[PDB]
């Protein structure tokens, strides 16, 4: 419902990488007004808890955001944004991921990393 | 207006303290589902940026999300979260934000800290 | 002994809590030169490294720093510097400390936040 | 002199671009002991320093650390350890460093990255 609430779109899923959009409008941005910085992160966090869920048995485990770090770039006012995460770490406890956040201009607006848990 | 979408409510504001909470609902949860650690990520942002905001003079300068960092520590599928936003560093171009984000069990969810660049 | 090489003192150690300074010399210095980030870093790291094994049973367990972040305030031109660490988190498979390091002038040089694995 | 400290060499610099390597020995390890996680960050942080003082006019302007953020993936024992910093993004008073550092057997030993103040000297 997150996904739904902020209009994510999932453009690509393979193994260790997944690229997810959205829409920069009125509801995500902040008051003066860009796109809001925690939008783009959970846009990222997003990306990459659907990239580690797809590369655990489910029934099993389950993937938790544990860290997320990240550098704000460049602004997004308007258009779509895209999160491109990267698998750098596929460990038994813990996956490390790469994430980019792009506009439509290819310009970086956010560059990030999460490390996710994979709990019993 | 992300603030509007989250049901995000200003609680307390002095300068060097801002605190903000909002209700954990189902638009704001992972599938899962706990409450999005995205979500609570773009709770933390919010704080400090308002906090920065206050600190300044709104017509020469703007506060922008530079970097930010979170931990996430506890799951939270219910009730309240609350924000609590404490300045470390307010320096002329920079102010740096601890910011700690508890359920209604007073639980530590989400710790986190955030870098806001002050611009002309 | 990266304790020796830095010539790290521990000042006092009690569960949760770990005081740690060390004398800002010219082998710990940038070239510039003020205190080298990453030694501030180190005496950090070294901080909650030490707390996580005061926590558990080390005929068992290890502690394998898993994920570090800080931000650097002032500069350290001389004297000595000291890390705070106290623990937020005390999980069972892992540990989140915060960590002040501060100057002889009662400066925040550095505020960091340390995750620390606990692996059979 | 932390460079020296921690005996590393400087292999490569171009443009956006840092590798720098140092020998794991017992004056970097942890006790138990592997290279110590601080080192490795020490390292990182020494190679988007020296990144941005190239970058930069020196006689003006000094690049400060503002930011690093880590992850541990992998230790190391012994051989040598290797950081390549290559830059994210040069703004006027900020450059953000992405830090690889890699063992002998080409594994990760720790990411990282790095934000770097641009100031008036």
Redesign the interface.
């Known amino acids: 419902?997150?996904?739904?609430?902020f209009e994510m779109s999932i453009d690509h899923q393979e193994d260790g990488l997944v690229v997810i959009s959205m829409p920069v409008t009125?509801?995500?941005?902040?008051?003066?007004?860009y796109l809001?910085?925690?939008?783009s992160?959970?846009?990222?966090?997003?990306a990459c808890?659907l990239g580690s869920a797809n590369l655990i048995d489910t029934t099993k485990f389950?993937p938790?955001?544990?860290?997320?770090?990240?550098?704000?770039?460049h602004?997004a006012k308007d258009g779509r944004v895209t999160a491109t995460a990267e698998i750098?770490?596929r460990?038994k406890?813990?996956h490390?991921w790469?994430i980019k956040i792009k506009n439509d201009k290819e310009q970086?607006i956010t560059?990030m990393?999460g490390?996710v848990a994979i709990k019993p």
Chains 1, 2, 3 share one sequence.
Do not use: C, W, Y
């Open positions: 419902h997150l996904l739904e609430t009125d509801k995500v941005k902040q008051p003066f007004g809001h910085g925690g939008a992160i959970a846009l990222g966090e997003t808890s389950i938790l955001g544990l860290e997320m770090n990240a550098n704000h770039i602004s750098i770490h460990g406890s813990t490390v790469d970086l560059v990393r490390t």
